[PDB]
């Protein structure tokens, strides 16, 4: 998926019931597979310490 554009896409669909999970990943930029190569995450592998709030947007 990493060798395609399918990495960036998160599946959601019509399914029976609700309360099923869509995704989960841990908060830890600059370590996690998900966040280490993001633009935020690569200004954060040059640093040992980090502080503050992070905002995720979904579209």
């Amino acid at each position: 998926k990493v060798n395609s554009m399918e990495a960036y896409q998160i599946p959601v669909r019509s399914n029976e019931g609700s309360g099923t999970q869509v995704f989960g990943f841990p908060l830890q930029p600059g370590y996690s597979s998900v966040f280490s190569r993001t633009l935020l995450g690569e200004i954060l592998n040059y640093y040992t310490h980090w502080s503050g709030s992070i905002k995720l947007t979904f579209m």
Binding site: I10, Q21, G24
Partner: protein, 269 residues
């Protein structure tokens, strides 16, 4: 720098800061008090380590060459570029255009080479490093007339002293150095691509000024670049692939990220 959190109570309002349109190409200015109840916090944190003149202003080894006081390879030649070595190169390529003054520092070491010479007894070595601006004579041997240094900057250094250093101005003919060039130098659009003369800044030569010993000694000179007085414009995504060549942007296709088991798993593989 860092801003202070402001306290917030309950809401029930026609305001909708959380909802946004990300199609507009605008990063939302939502702060935590918008989406939840927060307390007032005083922050005393600073953004002083993430200045561009902190990030780029540390010495970094760019190259090293070797030369001997006997046989072939009597001197070392190097065309000054910060693109031979990966680590410095990657940092500068967070930007399209940069402008800075260098400080060169040289760590010159010498090592005795195996031989069957009886009764070696080195004298102290003195080394000459000669900076030659673009154009003009190039030494073709140790003991040419080019090492006179009538108008070429040069330093002499005897062993067991502090590393030499010298400052270099900003030497571009342009108003900034460019780290990327999407063109040809020829009007026909033939020949090498991505080659430009905005980043010329001469060649460096290094030799021994004496062979102290009867036996062979080989020296290694390491060049360190330290940007200072930096200004930078137009930021770019970091390099994702390993570099291949020093004159090209050529790459082997690399995956976006490393893998993991599922889209719900909380560990890396």
């Amino acid at each position: 720098r860092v801003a202070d959190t402001v306290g917030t109570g309950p809401t029930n309002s026609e305001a909708i800061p959380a909802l946004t349109a990300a199609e507009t190409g605008h990063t939302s200015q939502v702060v935590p008090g918008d989406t939840m109840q927060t307390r007032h916090v005083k922050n005393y944190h600073s953004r002083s380590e993430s200045t561009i003149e902190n990030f780029l202003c540390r010495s970094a080894c760019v190259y090293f060459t070797e030369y001997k006081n006997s046989g072939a390879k009597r001197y070392a030649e190097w065309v000054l570029t910060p693109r031979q070595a990966a680590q410095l190169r990657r940092k500068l390529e967070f930007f399209t255009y940069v402008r800075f003054d260098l400080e060169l520092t040289f760590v010159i070491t010498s090592t005795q080479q195996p031989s069957t010479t009886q009764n070696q007894d080195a004298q102290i070595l003195t080394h000459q490093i000669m900076y030659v601006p673009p154009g003009g004579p190039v030494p073709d041997k140790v003991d040419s007339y080019v090492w006179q240094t009538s108008t070429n900057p040069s330093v002499f250094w005897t062993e067991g002293n502090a590393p030499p250093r010298m400052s270099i101005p900003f030497l571009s003919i342009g108003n900034a150095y460019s780290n990327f060039y999407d063109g040809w130098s020829e009007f026909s659009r033939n020949g090498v691509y991505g080659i430009n003369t905005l980043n010329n800044m001469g060649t460096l030569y290094a030799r021994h000024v004496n062979a102290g010993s009867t036996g062979p000694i080989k020296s290694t000179i390491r060049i360190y670049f330290k940007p200072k007085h930096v200004k930078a414009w137009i930021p770019r995504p970091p390099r994702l692939c390993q570099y291949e060549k020093a004159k090209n942007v050529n790459f082997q296709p690399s995956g976006v990220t490393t893998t993991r088991q599922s889209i719900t798993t909380m560990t890396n593989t």
